[PDB]
Amino acid sequence: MSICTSEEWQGLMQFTLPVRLCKEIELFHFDIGPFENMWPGIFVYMVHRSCGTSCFELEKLCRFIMSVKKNYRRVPYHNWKHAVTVAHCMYAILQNNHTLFTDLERKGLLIACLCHDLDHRGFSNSYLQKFDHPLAALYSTSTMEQHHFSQTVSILQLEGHNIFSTLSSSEYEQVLEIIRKAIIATDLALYFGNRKQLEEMYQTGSLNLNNQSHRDRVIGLMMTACDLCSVTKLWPVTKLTANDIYAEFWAEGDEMKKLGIQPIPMMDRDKKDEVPQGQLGFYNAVAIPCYTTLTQILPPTEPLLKACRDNLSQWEKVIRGE
Numbered sequence: 600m601s602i603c604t605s606e607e608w609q610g611l612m613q614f615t616l617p618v619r620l621c622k623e624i625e626l627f628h629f630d631i632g633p634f635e636n637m638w639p640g641i642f643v644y645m646v647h648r649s650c651g652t653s654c655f656e657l658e659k660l661c662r663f664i665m666s667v668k669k670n671y672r673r674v675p676y677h678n679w680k681h682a683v684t685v686a687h688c689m690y691a692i693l694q695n696n697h698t699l700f701t702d703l704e705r706k707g708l709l710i711a712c713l714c715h716d717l718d719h720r721g722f723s724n725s726y727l728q729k730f731d732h733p734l735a736a737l738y739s740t741s742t743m744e745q746h747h748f749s750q751t752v753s754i755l756q757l758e759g760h761n762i763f764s765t766l767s768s769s770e771y772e773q774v775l776e777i778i779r780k781a782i783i784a785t786d787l788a789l790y791f792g793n794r795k796q797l798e799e800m801y802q803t804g805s806l807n808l809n810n811q812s813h814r815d816r817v818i819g820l821m822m823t824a825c826d827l828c829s830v831t832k833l834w835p836v837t838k839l840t841a842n843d844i845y846a847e848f849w850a851e852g853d854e855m856k857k858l859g860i861q862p863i864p865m866m867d868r869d870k871k872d873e874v875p876q877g878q879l880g881f882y883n884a885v886a887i888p889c890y891t892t893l894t895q896i897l898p899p900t901e902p903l904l905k906a907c908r909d910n911l912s913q914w915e916k917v918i919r920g921e
């Protein structure tokens with residue numbers, strides 16, 4: 600477990616956001632890319648605008664954010680930048696659906712989003728389950744996500760890091776549970792069943808946000824949408840992100856070879872040719888249906904769908920030579 604320094608969180612405390620960004624950070628298409636130094640501060644701003652300036656003890660919030668940063672690993676995709684990107688997407692969804700969600704949910708989900716990939720190594724659950732490895736022993740299913748939550752709680756248990764302490768014991772356990780379910784939901788394995796249920800519920804007319812089980816599903820699909828949102832950015836950003844994603848997939852393939860196994864095309868660096876086709880399959884089977892269902896449930900989320908559609912069209916162009 601890694602801790603931030605005095606200079607880091609106090610520096611973050613000192614930070615103010617540039618005026619121009621305030622309007623832009625509100626939009627779904629906002630790309631955090633050009634503002635690396637401002638990422639810790641962008642999260643603070645988002646938390647302050649959604650939840651309130653007095654929602655958390657400022658010192659504790661800053662200690663929390665900077666320490667979270669330090670427990671994201673220097674990997675190609677599943678890193679600190681991804682964490683902030685996902686959180687911003689959540690902010691955009693929340694702001695556009697503000698009253699559908701309690702203060703506790705909004706606090707929980709923003710923190711969950713920032714923490715949802717903590718200590719990621721760049722390896723899949725499928726990998727750890729085949730080559731145990733303690734993490735698959737401790738968490739038989741779903742496996743890194745269980746680990747990410749454990750990491751979240753560990754950070755909260757550091758001195759002056761517990762941003763939820765001022766909540767009632769009831770609200771404290773609730774928010775932890777909101778956070779646990781949200782992080783677990785970012786296991787893409789679980790997404791497929793979840794979207795099908797929600798599709799059924801919305802089609803039939805059964806969907807009821809006052810129903811906790813329904814509610815948990817809706818939050819789940821929100822988690823997938825945020826986790827996938829690099830497919831909703833501008834083409835040149837989306838393109839570069841895909842390269843970081845495959846950089847990770849190929850290292851895992853290398854290990855499968857490096858220890859004698861033949862990996863699927865996706866994780867085989869000798870099969871880059873098949874990538875455009877793979878990304879099209881991913882959009883058609885994962886991303887498009889996800890933002891479709893989300894738009895059906897939360898109509899203000901429609902520009903995520905359109906941005907995803909635009910990027911699909913860009914993959915179709917690649918495939919056919921244009």
Ligand SMILES: COc1cc(OC)c2nnc3c(C)nc(-c4ccccc4Cl)n3c2c1
Binds near residue numbers: 785828829830865878
């Ligand atoms: C099998 O996992 C894939 C395959 C993709 O393209 C074919 C993927 N293509 N794009 C992805 C993005 C933006 N985010 C993810 C992702 C989501 C949850 C967990 C891990 C990742 Cl990398 N993926 C993919 C995930």
Ligand SMILES: [Mg+2]
Binds near residue numbers: 715716785786
């Ligand atoms: Mg994850």
Ligand SMILES: [Zn+2]
Binds near residue numbers: 681685715716785826
């Ligand atoms: Zn993620």
